[PDB]
Design a binder for this molecule. Structure first.
Ligand SMILES: Nc1ccn([C@@H]2O[C@H](COP(=O)(O)OP(=O)(O)O)[C@@H](O)[C@H]2O)c(=O)n1
Ligand SMILES: Nc1ccn([C@@H]2O[C@H](COP(=O)(O)OP(=O)(O)O)[C@@H](O)[C@H]2O)c(=O)n1
Ligand SMILES: [Ca+2]
Ligand SMILES: [Ca+2]
Ligand SMILES: [Ca+2]
Ligand SMILES: [Ca+2]
Lengths: 341, 333
């Protein structure tokens, strides 16, 4: 057992995006493999190692790892103390005194973690920072199946986080958002079938809306510690259905004009699925996140749906199929070659 | 460090399916996290734990785990001894005496492992058992296809052929089958179906040879799956393209059949990605895994109805995908 001692503060009682700051630090530390102990005066229990947090803080880091005794720091400011089990041999019943003693007996290195020390004034700042930590990127500490693409990170996340902020105060669950996001893709697909510029235009808009909202399910999940294995599975599986159904609807309509589009449609659908499959198969076989180091063709899902959007507003959904089919299939082949090395 | 002491025997020099029995026991124990030491007379080195194998044996178990002192047994027969580090406090330079001493000081529980004690006559028996140990397979794969592939892998074992080469070669066969479909004649459709089934069988050999010769790799596992997605797509696309000339409606059935094939694979691999365990339904599941899909294509092709295969794959495949979505709601998260 590992113990995390967190000094009580009146500000921990304030709610930030659905959860009190008290449960947030509690769950983050629990995730990190610590049994949590809130205290006013500290009585020491036996454990392998000790984490001590004296000042009120919001931890933003997601995959916190503490190996070896060190001082945890946020931008030069001490966030907490991580001592070894031998701290028991120094503790004298006074926390202030004991920390001074233990620190003098050692030379602890500083260790940077993403966190914000909390004040009565900077809670608006903490909200924005907490939201920004919800994105699938390396800076946050998350270890997903894949990281957000450029379109996702700089465009879609900007909108979805604003939506998730409003959803945080509700009882809406990630799975519900996932299903709703999937349903939106069907609305977009149905609009394509009506075969008119207006409905084609509306479809593209809704497909992009779907692309954005499909980020909210993951955001709320990470934001409220409601992540789940099934949720992760469902989120992905339905995205394959969406990609397939969207391309089918566009292909079916275009086939009325020229049957050749069946082939381009077939190739576009396959590409979309294989970009997903190559990445998820990598995770399955390597048991680590898929992430290209250098050159990669920007044809990840965030790009594919933006392309469908952009092409749809100019009434050329066929061009999106061509682009996805070409860029997508070459990217799939590229991954095969790149992984050989 | 954990040390595995294996007493030398003349039989370890014999070759079984491409590798000497000496190399096989060495590699198997290394996989299990042991440093191996072959010996005539035993001199003891310091280590966390000790594994002692006195009689010549071929280990068939794949995921051997040794936690806590035990005697390793195969059908009542002692295969080896697994002693704690405290064996150092008893060893007196004589192996027989030291083992006798340590065994009398303890009360070792027995622990069953899959293995066969080796002799000069039962090597044919060891070959069959080793081959059988190479095979989440569907019923068709396990009871039909494996029967043929193991016989092929047996011949491949004596060669320098790698798993990746078999995977790519298998992928090539699927293209030949697809090309034959495009020629639009019963004969070529019949030949196509046969090659698709041959492809299905040989697609088991890459995994067999990999496990048989300890040549498993992450990229190999990745490639094995990815190219099978390519094969499934190209086969269905090829059948659909020809059939579309008669009735364009088959484009829709083809799209649904291709999608189904890909999603049966994706749902399974995505499960592994999210749950980090093998996908395996406890009870009922619609038999439309790859071994079934390709047999259906084969069976329908010999009677010149490849269109029926698309319908069947499209129907059973999509319902199975949907079934998995609903079934997984149960015990997960
Ligand atoms: N219903 C859901 C949806 C996502 N998640 C989690 O969030 C991750 C996906 O985040 P995301 O939705 O922002 O990713 P994208 O689909 O936008 O690319 C999944 O892998 C899950 O870990 C969940 O737990 N339950
Ligand atoms: N070129 C290859 C092919 C398979 N393998 C391994 O063998 C497994 C596949 O076994 P298999 O080919 O007998 O059965 P299938 O999964 O292909 O139906 C892969 O998951 C790999 O662990 C490999 O390492 N390299
Ligand atoms: Ca999502
Ligand atoms: Ca989704
Ligand atoms: Ca294979
Ligand atoms: Ca394969």
């Amino acid at each position: 057992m590992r113990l995390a001692y967190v000094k009580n503060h009146e500000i921990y009682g304030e709610k930030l995006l659905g959860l009190t700051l008290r449960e947030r630090i509690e769950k983050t530390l629990q995730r990190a493999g610590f049994d949590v102990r809130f205290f006013d005066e500290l009585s020491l229990e036996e454990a392998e190692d000790y984490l001590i947090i004296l000042e009120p803080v919001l931890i933003l880091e997601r995959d916190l790892l503490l190996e070896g005794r060190k001082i945890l720091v946020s931008d030069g400011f001490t966030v907490g103390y991580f001592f070894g089990g031998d701290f028991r041999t120094v503790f004298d019943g006074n926390l202030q005194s004991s920390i001074e003693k233990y620190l003098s007996l050692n030379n602890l290195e500083s260790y940077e973690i993403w966190a914000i020390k909390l004040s009565n004034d900077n809670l608006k700042t903490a909200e924005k920072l907490l939201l920004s930590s919800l994105i699938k990127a390396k800076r946050t500490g998350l270890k997903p199946a894949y990281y957000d693409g450029w379109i996702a990170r700089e465009i879609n996340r900007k909108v979805s986080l604003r939506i998730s902020r409003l959803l945080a105060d509700t009882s809406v669950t990630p799975n519900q958002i996932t299903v709703f996001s999937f349903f939106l893709s069907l609305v977009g697909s149905a609009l394509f079938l009506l075969n008119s510029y207006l409905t084609t235009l509306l479809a593209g808009v809704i497909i992009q809306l779907h692309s954005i909202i499909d980020g909210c399910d993951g955001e709320i999940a990470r934001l409220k510690f409601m992540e789940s294995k099934y949720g992760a599975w469902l989120d992905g599986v339905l995205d394959r259905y969406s990609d397939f159904i969207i391309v089918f609807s566009i292909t079916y309509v275009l086939s009325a004009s020229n049957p050749v589009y069946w082939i381009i449609g077939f190739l576009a659908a396959f590409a979309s699925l294989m970009i997903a499959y190559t990445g998820d198969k990598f995770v399955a076989a390597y048991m680590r996140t898929y992430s290209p180091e250098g050159f990669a063709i920007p044809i990840t899902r965030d790009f594919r749906l933006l392309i469908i959007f952009a092409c749809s507003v100019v009434n050329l959904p066929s061009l999106a199929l061509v682009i996805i089919a070409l860029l997508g299939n070459f990217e799939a082949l590229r991954r095969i070659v790149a992984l050989r090395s």
